[PDB]
Design a protein around this ligand. Structure first.
Ligand SMILES: CCCCCCCCCCCCCCCCCC(=O)OC[C@H](COP(=O)([O-])OCC[N+](C)(C)C)OC(=O)CCCCCCCCCCCCCCCCC
Ligand SMILES: CCCCCCCCCCCCCCCCCC(=O)OC[C@H](COP(=O)([O-])OCC[N+](C)(C)C)OC(=O)CCCCCCCCCCCCCCCCC
Ligand SMILES: OCCN(CCO)c1nc(N2CCCCC2)c2nc(N(CCO)CCO)nc(N3CCCCC3)c2n1
Ligand SMILES: OCCN(CCO)c1nc(N2CCCCC2)c2nc(N(CCO)CCO)nc(N3CCCCC3)c2n1
Ligand SMILES: *[C@@H]1O[C@H](CO)[C@@H](O[C@H]2O[C@H](CO)[C@@H](O)[C@H](O)[C@H]2NC(C)=O)[C@H](O)[C@H]1NC(C)=O
Ligand SMILES: *[C@@H]1O[C@H](CO)[C@@H](O[C@H]2O[C@H](CO)[C@@H](O)[C@H](O)[C@H]2NC(C)=O)[C@H](O)[C@H]1NC(C)=O
Ligand SMILES: CC(C)CCC[C@@H](C)[C@H]1CC[C@H]2[C@@H]3CC=C4C[C@@H](O)CC[C@]4(C)[C@H]3CC[C@]12C
Ligand SMILES: CC(C)CCC[C@@H](C)[C@H]1CC[C@H]2[C@@H]3CC=C4C[C@@H](O)CC[C@]4(C)[C@H]3CC[C@]12C
Ligand SMILES: CC(C)CCC[C@@H](C)[C@H]1CC[C@H]2[C@@H]3CC=C4C[C@@H](O)CC[C@]4(C)[C@H]3CC[C@]12C
Ligand SMILES: CC(C)CCC[C@@H](C)[C@H]1CC[C@H]2[C@@H]3CC=C4C[C@@H](O)CC[C@]4(C)[C@H]3CC[C@]12C
Ligand SMILES: CC(C)CCC[C@@H](C)[C@H]1CC[C@H]2[C@@H]3CC=C4C[C@@H](O)CC[C@]4(C)[C@H]3CC[C@]12C
Ligand SMILES: CC(C)CCC[C@@H](C)[C@H]1CC[C@H]2[C@@H]3CC=C4C[C@@H](O)CC[C@]4(C)[C@H]3CC[C@]12C
Ligand SMILES: CC(C)CCC[C@@H](C)[C@H]1CC[C@H]2[C@@H]3CC=C4C[C@@H](O)CC[C@]4(C)[C@H]3CC[C@]12C
Ligand SMILES: CC(C)CCC[C@@H](C)[C@H]1CC[C@H]2[C@@H]3CC=C4C[C@@H](O)CC[C@]4(C)[C@H]3CC[C@]12C
Lengths: 516, 516
């Protein structure tokens, strides 16, 4: 029954993953028939879209429009639809991530330096990723995911959410730096690409919209598990907590018409950003210049790095989402998801669209959205394919529904990112122990490790995980950001060889447990 | 032991009030030796000052400077010092109120029409208030305060808090109306009296400062009764919850130097606002024109109205502050406080300074500030004279402490008013029953009246008190605002004659109880 086992035959895990979930496929359609599911579709849409808009914008300027917002949106749409329809864990949101953007920057700079075609280079990376993932899934390489314990899962899960929170505030600060609070402003300024100068009331309204959206979302989450209004109405309003918070604060900005706020800009149509550069289908052998055969084979070495990026990102996200404490009964497959995510991404490279990964926050957020609360204990989770499908389709149709997206500020969706960032920390025992450092020892949650492990030893354990978080954040800050996944890999040796020396088994078993 | 009893002798209550509290007078100095007491001094200072600044400003413009901020500040200082040193309940904050402001415009408008000297008119009102209060205290007229039950106390206490909250938002709205969020602004504008035109970033920053101060104050109140940090540090930070919230958000505005925010303006020195109109000491017989002897006797009729205003305001505030549920052991005197408050106010009229009253929110706020929490049950209250004395002295020295006050925005102190407004509702059973209207019947607090009175009957009782609140708010809105105290008087007949018909004794006794 345990997914992470070596069968001892070629593609044994892949078959066993299909065999376990596809029996539930008719349930994966009906279970979606709930208002809570529709509230998740609306929430996770904006959670899924705005990153693809942002990263696409960032790719555009750092890759000279070889790959822009349109390519990313279509990729997130097509791979999102397929993965929802064919995957093992539909609650995983497949999209673009920060470590993937860093690779594209380095790959572009590498290609620029050596003087090779970037987009043609990726096609080969994509082919080697298809070769590697088939070779990995063949021998059931996802068995090594067993070794990654809560220690490494939580260190990861915490770091990703901090980033998500950090970046959100970095955008608010950027708005304030762009539109400073001056004494006088210049009004003879163009706003056709974007505002050339500073603008009045822009930065403060952006803060008001961000703070307000995070407030309303949190207060409606507080309202969900309150004792006000009838139980039906309290849940319905609580389930649609974010969509109400968005609608309100979007309508707030709609009425404030004279003042400027930065909105969600999408491409005009379904066309590549730079048409002169590349077409919709990228040629392996080359576009303009004849692509070298040395790079055609040496594409293996970056593809190995991209595989490790997509593997760890996706497989650790699968762990986090399919934890025992989260009441997920339909079953999670680590081989079929890895095969699709990388396999699709490899074929996506052929059409000059970016390979994606099962992103942690968006996956967690989508799981948390579909998770229902009893009495605070988790009753069940609405595990189905319709939520992940509809989000992907809506992301695909984002280019068409510009009229609607044009009235939605970025400030409000940054308020939603802050809500996603804070909410992501909820079921992380690391974060729980970070709070206990500040709380006195008498006022502890009396959890198994609190009762058994000594207070100073528990804090010492928590201390070492901050040292790891700190080191990971330093590695992230430095140019060597593609080394970050390999530093997180060292978190597994730590718990395996280093901690057993300074700590005891009894404490280690209590602090780091598979189930709680 | 019960204060509200007829002794059956002249000035029996006054003697009995002195006899009960003055034995504790040495305790009323030492009990003030606590950090929590110093945190109250800082909090209640701004709570006491900014109203005198505002009402003084309002008197100034509606009385042609015959009485402005200077007179009000000195009155609140002198009467505040004396009442703290000589009073029965030092926790009562004596200051100017809205119903008193209504009388001063009404009396000025009367004097302007008939063509009489306003300030000389008040001197006679003051003499008749001294005659009435001595005649009332003689026969122990504060025995009628017994008839005022939680019903009328809570209806009052709630209405006063709603006003306090309403007015706060009316000032924010005014700022937004004054400094609208436009596309373009004019920078060639004078700001020497105040900004002549609209200004950028002023209204939104004012909202940010107000929202931020109310947030920090509430989160530090939430922190006070949390389980974070050692018990000493949690209380100390919790007790200084408002002063920290003020300091922070004042320093926030200090760093935002280019943008404009409206600050606390006080007079330059200790001089009357309009020297030409009149001097410090007002002459009974007249200043310029010979004051009529018909008004010298007819001054009784407005003085009777002012007495009823100051009596009900102060005596109902004394009830609220000296409730049984609030752990106040040193004893409350309703005769000695009424004698001082009105008697001082009558003598204050002679120097052209405004008669004051024991204001409900500022009294409640000051009591709530000095109230310590155990475990949520009230352990004790730090009842002493030093808090009320120091506030009054600081209000007196506000005119000299201009450099510090000039850097403090109004926006932040409006955030403190909102905090005072919401916190004032805490120990009001009316407000508690307003929440139970929305909550389901199964999730009720299990208080005596919840289990004894039927849910539909309790909601019917609460419904009638909203009808009263509504009627009182309508009477307040209309020109007849001096009729409001006499409408609140009718709240006592209601519970006495009208409710016993539709309701039963058992329910009435449970819903309206002297102790809980
Ligand atoms: C869940 C409820 C939480 C939200 C409820 C709302 C509470 C707060 C309401 C808004 C007020 C924010 C307080 C800070 C005020 C700063 C004012 C300002 O803009 O100053 C100018 C400053 C700029 O300072 P400056 O003027 O020195 O900049 C330099 C300018 N030159 C170069 C010209 C010298 O801007 C900022 O503050 C930017 C940084 C943002 C910091 C505030 C972000 C917080 C908002 C989201 C809330 C998240 C925390 C909540 C806690 C977690 C809860 C789970
Ligand atoms: C304890 C924490 C609670 C406080 C922090 C939570 C608040 C989050 C911070 C942001 C403020 C909220 C967003 C308000 C939306 C309006 C913003 C704006 O632009 O206004 C434009 C409007 C003006 O709109 P306008 O300018 O478009 O109107 C048109 C005018 N013409 C046509 C002339 C151009 O501003 C106002 O009217 C002010 C409204 C303020 C209302 C919000 C009050 C916030 C203060 C705290 C309230 C506490 C509530 C909870 C109490 C209970 C506590 C448990
Ligand atoms: O852009 C839209 C989303 N956001 C906004 C969040 O509010 C965002 N911006 C980032 N940017 C900073 C740097 C490069 C430009 C944008 C960024 N960078 C990184 N990293 C790469 C840098 O090494 C860190 C390693 O994961 N990781 C991010 N998360 C995304 C999900 C899975 C991974 C963690 C991330 N997220
Ligand atoms: O934090 C806000 C406090 N302020 C700011 C001024 O210091 C304020 N402003 C008022 N107004 C401003 C705008 C023009 C009118 C005055 C006002 N008006 C009334 N009343 C209605 C006038 O008829 C009387 C109703 O009983 N009562 C008030 N209270 C305060 C004392 C205890 C009692 C209730 C009151 N308070
Ligand atoms: C589309 O791609 C082409 C080819 O990469 C870009 O072409 C030229 O301009 C760039 C600067 O804008 C230079 O860095 C290139 O060297 C130059 N290349 C050639 C062959 O002329 C073009 O700018 C891109 N267009 C957009 C809209 O991004
Ligand atoms: C001080 O008081 C005097 C007397 O009331 C005010 O005097 C004059 O100006 C007023 C308008 O500003 C008129 O309404 C008065 O009728 C007029 N009275 C006389 C006798 O000339 C004076 O304005 C006040 N000054 C200030 C600073 O408020
Ligand atoms: C699903 C698609 C898009 C992924 C592409 C990867 C290919 C190579 C994968 C997907 C499904 C896989 C097959 C699934 C099941 C079996 C049955 C087993 O007895 C032998 C291997 C075999 C036949 C696998 C071979 C490899 C396979 C064909
Ligand atoms: C586009 C941006 C600005 C906001 C989008 C949010 C929209 C889609 C949200 C906000 C509030 C939502 C509604 C709130 C509650 C209910 C009751 C439920 O039983 C059926 C759906 C229904 C009727 C929702 C439909 C979707 C809804 C209208
Ligand atoms: C419709 C649902 C099921 C899928 C959502 C995504 C849809 C809208 C997207 C994904 C890929 C997109 C296509 C990608 C490529 C092209 C070629 C171009 O010359 C015309 C548009 C066209 C044909 C696009 C139309 C819209 C499209 C089909
Ligand atoms: C450079 C720093 C920030 C990175 C390392 C994280 C810091 C905060 C960690 C490392 C070791 C930790 C300490 C280890 C042991 C104890 C003893 C316990 O009774 C109280 C907490 C305390 C004192 C911990 C507090 C947090 C701590 C100081
Ligand atoms: C503070 C002053 C100026 C207020 C003036 C009010 C007058 C009427 C008050 C103030 C003090 C009062 C006296 C205080 C003490 C006593 C002793 C008692 O056994 C008989 C009544 C008697 C004699 C009181 C009578 C009324 C009294 C004289
Ligand atoms: C005038 C404006 C800026 C607000 C002024 C508030 C000042 C007076 C407040 C803010 C925070 C306060 C401090 C906070 C905590 C303590 C610790 C306590 O054991 C003694 C008092 C002391 C040291 C307070 C002194 C007064 C203080 C500095
Ligand atoms: C000092 C403490 C105990 C009391 C606080 C209030 C003080 C500062 C106030 C209240 C009344 C004020 C006085 C009122 C009247 C005048 C007359 C004027 O021509 C000079 C200033 C002078 C003399 C004031 C000085 C300051 C004063 C004494
Ligand atoms: C002038 C305005 C404020 C008047 C409205 C006040 C509201 C709150 C009052 C007026 C009439 C009241 C209702 C009258 C009758 C009933 C039926 C009873 O079985 C439960 C309470 C309930 C439902 C009351 C609830 C409160 C109520 C709705």
């Amino acid at each position: 029954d345990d997914p992470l086992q070596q069968t001892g035959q070629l593609f044994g895990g892949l078959v066993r993953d299909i065999r376990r979930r596809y029996p539930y496929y008719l349930s994966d359609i009906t279970d979606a028939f709930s208002p809570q599911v529709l509230a998740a579709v609306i929430f996770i849409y904006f959670a899924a879209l705005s990153p693809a808009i942002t990263f696409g914008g960032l790719l555009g300027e750092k890759t000279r429009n070889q790959m822009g917002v349109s390519e990313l949106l279509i990729s997130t749409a097509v791979q999102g639809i397929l993965f929802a329809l064919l995957g093992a864990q539909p609650l995983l949101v497949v999209g673009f991530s920060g470590p993937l953007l860093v690779f594209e920057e380095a790959f572009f700079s590498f290609c620029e330096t050596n003087g090779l075609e970037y987009i043609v280079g990726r096609v080969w990376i994509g082919f080697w990723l298809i070769l590697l993932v088939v070779l990995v899934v063949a021998f059931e390489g996802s068995f090594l995911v067993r070794f990654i314990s809560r220690y490494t899962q939580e260190i990861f899960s915490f770091l990703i959410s901090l980033i998500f929170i950090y970046e959100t505030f970095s955008k608010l600060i950027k708005i304030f730096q762009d539109h400073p609070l001056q004494k006088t402003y210049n009004y003879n300024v163009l706003m056709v690409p974007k505002p050339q100068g500073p603008l009045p009331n822009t930065a403060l309204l952006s803060l008001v919209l961000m703070a307000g959206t995070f407030f309303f979302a949190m207060m409606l989450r507080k309202f969900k598990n309150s004792s006000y209004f009838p139980g039906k109405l309290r849940r319905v309003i609580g389930d649609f907590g974010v969509p109400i918070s968005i609608l309100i604060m979007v309508l707030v900005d709609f009425f404030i018409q004279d003042t400027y706020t930065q909105k969600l800009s999408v491409p005009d149509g379904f066309k590549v950003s730079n048409s002169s550069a590349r077409g919709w289908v990228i040629h392996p052998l080359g576009l303009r210049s004849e692509f070298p055969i040395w790079m055609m084979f040496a594409s293996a070495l970056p593809a190995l790095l991209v595989f490790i990026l997509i593997f760890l990102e996706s497989q650790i996200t699968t762990l986090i989402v399919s934890k025992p404490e989260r009441k997920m009964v339909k079953g999670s497959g680590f081989h079929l998801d890895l095969l699709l995510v990388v396999g699709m991404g490899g074929v996506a490279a052929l059409f000059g669209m970016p390979w994606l990964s099962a992103t942690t926050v968006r996956s967690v957020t989508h799981a948390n959205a579909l998770t229902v609360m009893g009495k605070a204990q988790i009753q069940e989770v609405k595990e189905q394919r319709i939520s992940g499908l509809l989000v992907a389709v809506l992301v695909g149709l984002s280019i068409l529904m510009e009229p609607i997206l044009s009235r939605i500020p970025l400030a409000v969706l940054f308020g939603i990112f802050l809500y996603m960032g804070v909410t992501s920390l909820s079921g992380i025992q690391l974060f729980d122990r970070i709070l206990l450092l500040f709380k006195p020892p008498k006022y502890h949650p009396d959890v198994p490790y609190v009762k058994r492990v000594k207070t100073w030893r528990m804090h010492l354990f928590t201390g070492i995980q901050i040292i790891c978080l700190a080191v990971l954040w330093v590695v992230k800050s430095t140019p060597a950001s593609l080394a970050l996944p390999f530093v997180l890999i060292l978190t597994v040796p730590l718990r395996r060889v280093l901690l057993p020396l300074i700590f005891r088994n009894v404490e280690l078993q209590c602090l780091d447990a598979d189930d709680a």
